[PDB]
């Protein structure tokens, strides 16, 4: 299941620094860096609005097609430095990638469906590491809860993992734990 890369435009940062980054961030642009086996850390401003839009559409983990001054590159979002408060993305890290390339990544895990009513489902690890190709990276994968029995644990090793993707996390990492819903005489008994 190939995911189509998203087409952004970028242009080489003329000069570097906190003043330059603050100014660029002020003009609705995100400073970022390309690296990888391209062996050239290349400093690129890109459109903040388009960056946020594509991150909304295809999560944190999505291939991009960068147009660097006409040259055409394939990139993959490695990290995003984001402000804790203003929540704007400050910086981005872009591994260079090509087809048929396995890469390690972290994919969010969103529990889906309703559970049995007497107990609450609670996730400890929201993200699971997987090894997968550049184009075949899943932006999210689901875990099944449909009327479980009494409280039991779920680990990464029993998830319906996609095709062409490989678990990296040790299979005994807990993801979602159904824990019995606290009674009336049990909910306010902890916390002091």
Partner RNA sequence: UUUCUUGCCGGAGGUAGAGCUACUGGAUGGCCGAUGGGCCCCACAGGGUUACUGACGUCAGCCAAACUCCGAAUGCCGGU
Partner RNA sequence: UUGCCUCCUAAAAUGUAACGGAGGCGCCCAAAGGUUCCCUCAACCUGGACGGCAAUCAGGUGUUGAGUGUAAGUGCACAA
Partner RNA sequence: GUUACGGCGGUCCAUAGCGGCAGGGAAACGCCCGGUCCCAUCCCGAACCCGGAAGCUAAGCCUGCCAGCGCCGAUGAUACUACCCAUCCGGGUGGAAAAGUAGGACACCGCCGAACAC
Torsion, CA 143, CA 175, CA 137, CA 25, rounded to 10? 120
DSSP letters, 75-98, are EEEEEEEE-TTT--EEEEEEEE--
Would you say 27 or 163 has its CB closer to RNA?
Answer: 27
Q: Which stretch binds RNA (CB under 7 A): 10-18, 62-70, 113-121, 141-149?
A: 10-18
Residue from the set 8, 10, 32, 134 that interacts with RNA by CB under 7 A: 32
Tokens standing for residue 147: 């009327």
Q: Taking CB under 7 A as the rule, does residue 35 contact RNA?
A: yes
**Per CB under 7 A, 120 contacts RNA:** no
Please state the φ and ψ torsions of residue 30, each to the nearest 5 degrees: -110, 125
Q: What angle do CA 59, 65, 71 make, to 5 degrees?
A: 155
The distance of Cα 137 from the centroid of its chain, to the nearest Å, equals 10
Which of 57, 126, 144, 158 is the binder for other proteins (CB under 8 A)?
Answer: 126
| Cα atoms in the Cβ-side hemisphere of radius 13 Å centred on 164 | 14
Q: Which of other proteins, RNA, none sits in contact with 182, Cβ below 5 to 8 A by type? A: other proteins
| Contact residues for other proteins, defined by CB under 8 A | 60, 82, 84-85, 87, 120, 122, 126, 179, 181-184, 187-188, 191-192
| Contact residues for RNA, defined by CB under 7 A | 16-23, 25, 31-33, 35-37, 41, 43, 78-79, 81, 90-91, 93, 95, 104, 124-125, 151, 153, 173-174, 177, 179, 190-191
């Amino acid at each position: 299941t190939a995911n189509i890369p998203n087409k952004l435009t970028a242009n080489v940062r003329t000069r570097t620094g906190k003043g330059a980054s603050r100014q660029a961030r002020r003009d609705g642009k995100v400073p970022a860096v390309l690296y990888g086996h391209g062996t050239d850390p290349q400093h690129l401003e890109l459109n903040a609005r388009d960056f946020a839009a594509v991150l909304r559409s295809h999560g944190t983990n999505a291939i991009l097609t960068l147009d660097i001054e006409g040259t055409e590159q394939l990139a993959l979002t490695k990290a995003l430095d984001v402000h804790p408060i203003r929540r704007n993305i400050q910086h981005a890290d872009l591994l260079v990638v090509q087809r048929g390339e396995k890469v390690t990544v972290e994919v969010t895990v969103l529990v889906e469906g309703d559970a049995t009513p007497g107990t609450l489902v609670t996730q400890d690890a929201n993200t699971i590491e997987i090894e997968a190709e550049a184009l075949s990276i899943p932006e999210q994968l689901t875990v099944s809860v449909e009327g479980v029995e009494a409280g039991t644990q779920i680990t990464a090793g029993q998830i319906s993992l996609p095709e062409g993707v490989n678990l990296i996390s040790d299979p005994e990492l807990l993801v979602v734990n159904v824990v019995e819903a606290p009674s009336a005489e049990a909910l306010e008994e902890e916390g002091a």
